[PDB]
Every structure is written in C-alpha cells, then in structure tokens.
Amino acid sequence: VNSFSGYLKLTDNVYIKNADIVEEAKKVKPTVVVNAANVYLKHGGGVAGALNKATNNAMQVESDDYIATNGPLKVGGSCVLSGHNLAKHCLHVVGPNVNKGEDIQLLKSAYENFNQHEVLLAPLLSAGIFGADPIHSLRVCVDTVRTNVYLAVFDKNLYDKLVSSFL
Ligand SMILES: O=C1[C@H](Nc2ncnc3[nH]c4cc(F)ccc4c23)CCN1CCF
C-alpha cells in the first residue's frame, strides 16, 4: 500500500491521473519523482522548468554542479539527484526531443531507467515540448516499465484521450 490517491489503474504496474506533477509531488513526497530532463540538465520549461521553479532554483544549482563534474547525460540516459522539497530523489531522465531530431526509438531506453526504482511518480517521457505523441509514450511506458509507475498528466483533455484510447 502506498499514498498515491485518485489514480486509474491501466495495468498490473502502471497508474495514471490528471494532475500537476509539482502539486502531486508536494503532496505525496514520493521516494522518486521523474524529471523530463535534457542532457545539459537545463531546466527551462515544460515539466523540468516547473519542477525546478518549485525548488526555488535549487534543482538547477545542483544540476549545474553535476554537469560541471560529469558532463552531459546521454539521450535515453538518466541520473539520480536530490528531490529537494518535492521527493527524496529526482530521477532526471532524458527522452528524445523530436523538435531536435532525436531518434524516437531511444524512448524505450529512457523508460528502462525507471526499472531501477520500485515506485516512481513520473510524467510521460518525450511528451509536451519534447514533441512526441503522448499516446505512443504511454504505450512504450506500459511495455517497458515493470516497476510501479504513477503517471501525472497535466492536461485534462490529453488525459481523457490517453484513457479512452488505451488498449
Ligand atoms: O500535460 C501534459 C503532460 N505533462 C505534465 N504532466 C504533469 N505535470 C506537468 N507539469 C507541467 C508543467 C509544464 F510547464 C509543462 C508540462 C507539464 C506536465 C504530458 C504532455 N502534456 C500536455 C501539454 F504539455
């Protein structure tokens, strides 16, 4: 039993809700919140900009030190950093950004990072400003993640479409 509330159950391990991931993280304080990161951990907009803003820019400060030490992530890769006031940990995961021409096949590799964590609160990878089809992202999530994932979808219209079209 966990503290996630109001989710629709899609499969044995995947759950979905129309929610602001920032507000959901602040309420649940999950062990792991997933960020929709880029390879430079520049949290300017989308989910990343919102999460970082909620940390009062502490996420960005920590991320800049991470990059200065380690260099950029790979597309499809991830790193574990602090969750600040939102979660114990933040798993920064880089899905391909279609608006940069990145290979959508890397979306499966991106979701594989979730399997290193027993339970996660997450957005749909490569959705929103990353330019991928969210219906496809949900399909890849369900077919790749085996651990327990609680998906927050900000847009109510998109949420209803994701549920109604789910196979
Ligand atoms: O709403 C969503 C889903 N992403 C989110 N899910 C949960 N919380 C979120 N907070 C955000 C804050 C932002 F500035 C930008 C995006 C999100 C977001 C996936 C695609 N989509 C439609 C429009 F992008």
Curated annotation (Swiss-Prot):
Record text on activity regulation: Inhibited in vitro by GRL-0617.
Domain of life: Viruses
N-terminal signal peptide: none
Catalytic reactions of this protein: Thiol-dependent hydrolysis of ester, thioester, amide, peptide and isopeptide bonds formed by the C-terminal Gly of ubiquitin (a 76-residue protein attached to proteins as an intracellular targeting signal)
Coiled coil: none
Limits of the Macro domain: 1-167
Membrane topology designation: Multi-pass membrane protein
Localization per Swiss-Prot or TrEMBL: Host endoplasmic reticulum membrane
Record note on quaternary structure: May form homohexamers. Interacts with N protein.
Function: Responsible for the cleavages located at the N-terminus of the replicase polyprotein. Participates together with nsp4 in the assembly of virally-induced cytoplasmic double-membrane vesicles necessary for viral replication. Antagonizes innate immune induction of type I interferon by blocking the phosphorylation, dimerization and subsequent nuclear translocation of host IRF3. Also prevents host NF-kappa-B signaling. In addition, PL-PRO possesses a deubiquitinating/deISGylating activity and processes both 'Lys-48'- and 'Lys-63'-linked polyubiquitin chains from cellular substrates.
Protein's recorded name: Papain-like protease nsp3
Native source organism of the sequence: Severe acute respiratory syndrome coronavirus 2
Lineage start: Viruses, Riboviria, Orthornavirae, Pisuviricota, Pisoniviricetes
Residues of the whole record sequence present: 1025 to 1191 of 7096
